[PDB]
């Protein structure tokens, strides 16, 4: 078991995708999330707010365990570090994001989980051996979905994904369901009328009806 | 603004790919395109005639902007330059092309626009990284189309695309209409048939009947 | 002509890819599959008894042409070629692989055939560009299929392919007849519950089905 099965073991298989103008409204959204369930929080450095946001979560809900997405270069990563994130997710993989997660290890201090986007079995195999086994698969809806990671099954049965990118309440249970499949990524809890209003109590609902692995 | 972008506010979205056999044909070619108001034409090097279209075009044809497509080589770019090409482009991208590029840059010699295919989220970022933010998708139709490209709008909202492979009268401004697609690339502009029986009229018809950016 | 080429006239244009679970059943399987005029034969290493199996049909069945496929790191190269293997075929294809595809044509005791998977424009091009010009095409099903590789064909014209994954009895005809693909890899032949039963007849049913290249 990696850190992110022990995390997957302890909450629901859905990690947000979250896209925050406000800084504000990090917490209430957290708490929100957390209240129905879903506690592996993607906060993407898309915004100005994202890395405050990750930092004020991190601070304020313990309980939440809040990373960074769109994580494309080695400073986003640094950055990343220093704002709190407890995992990093990045769209695709290049050398310097290698290279960085390599040295951040190597010193030691850092000790989060590294899930890198990979989108050809080339990809996967460059991933695999610079140690990384657990993926982003993006954006999986738009490259073949469900029937590229089974194809992939075949010839990397050791290698498990997380499908993101066109993931939506009707196909996110068949995704889970592929037995190389371990969580995926949504973007439909945290859709940005909710956060601009407020409506934590529909945030929680939409939390709340995600299911856990074990109830596909 | 790019160059290319200059030159899109005073042309046609339309970049017409274009597979020439013979010389002659390319200068009345580029007449007839260009009084349909298409003005970026890509000559591929798919043909022997191809390098000495291009430099046909740019004497004869000032008001064209001519490049070469179907570059893959370092020598397939300088060739290019050597023949008069205005900007190039490539089917996908190897460090080979990278460093090409970066060095022609550098020299100062040819200022033109250099056009490379990706297809992967990590191929945009390699590309975006070596400093190229206007990139080929190829073949967008067949590799996810208008869902690949609105997919990687989210994570790379700075990269704009020129969609090339499968775009037709019927789906163009459709891709198009994509707020990250600025271009696209058409073969049915100069079909062969066209070209061989020198059918001027119709080459010119088909330009005429490509719309405006502004106009979808 | 290559060496693939020279095998290709030879035999059917179907290359097995075999998931052998036991030993012992290398052999008559192999037997079987020359039977129905398939001879091509591409052994997974994703058994421990890969490897053991090739050596098994190399001695045994020297009519059988005897490959590795799910070859993925320079470890897997250099097994395969000690256990027999006279072709290679990897899903994808890394710095490594092509580093030790280069080596081992150097030291030229190796002269068999490296048949790695490409995925984009871009990793057809880096395949190209190391000398490999007969290509896999993996997941080609999943990744655009016929249409990919036929919007490929336009900028890569000297390039073949071997398209692998969803290939099928209803499909595979229709994969072949491009003028770029030359050969393609297939499951159903070798079933598992086939090689379980020891139903030898039905796999020479099903190779003796599949039809030659000149008769599709």
Redesign the interface.
């Known amino acids: 078991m990696t850190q992110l099965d022990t995390w997957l073991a302890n909450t629901k298989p859905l990690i947000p995708v979250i896209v925050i103008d406000d800084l504000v409204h990090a917490i209430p959204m957290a708490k929100a999330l957390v209240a129905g369930g879903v506690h592996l929080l993607e906060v993407?450095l898309?915004t100005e707010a994202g890395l405050a946001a990750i930092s004020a979560i991190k601070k304020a809900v313990p309980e939440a365990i809040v990373g960074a997405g769109?994580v494309?270069?080695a400073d986003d990563f640094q950055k990343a570090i220093d704002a709190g994130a407890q995992f990093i997710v990045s769209?695709?993989?290049?050398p310097?994001l290698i290279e960085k997660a390599k040295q951040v290890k190597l010193d030691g201090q850092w000790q989060g989980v590294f899930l890198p986007?990979?989108?050809?079995?080339?990809?996967?195999?460059?991933a695999?051996?610079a140690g990384i086994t657990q993926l982003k698969c993006?954006?999986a809806?738009?490259?073949?979905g469900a029937?590229?990671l089974?194809?992939?099954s075949?010839?990397?049965?050791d290698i498990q994904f997380c499908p993101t990118?066109?993931i939506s309440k009707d196909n996110y249970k068949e995704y889970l369901g592929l037995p190389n499949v371990i969580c995926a990524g949504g973007s439909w809890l945290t859709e940005s009328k909710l956060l601009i209003e407020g409506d934590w109590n529909e945030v929680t609902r939409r939390a709340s009806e995600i299911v856990k692995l074990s109830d596909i």
Chains 1, 2, 3 share one sequence.
Do not use: Y
Not at 117 to 126: D, P, R
């Open positions: 993407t898309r769109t494309c270069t769209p695709g993989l290049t310097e986007g990979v989108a050809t079995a080339s990809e996967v195999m460059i695999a051996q993006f954006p809806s738009a490259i073949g029937k590229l089974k194809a992939w075949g010839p990397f049965p990118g066109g």
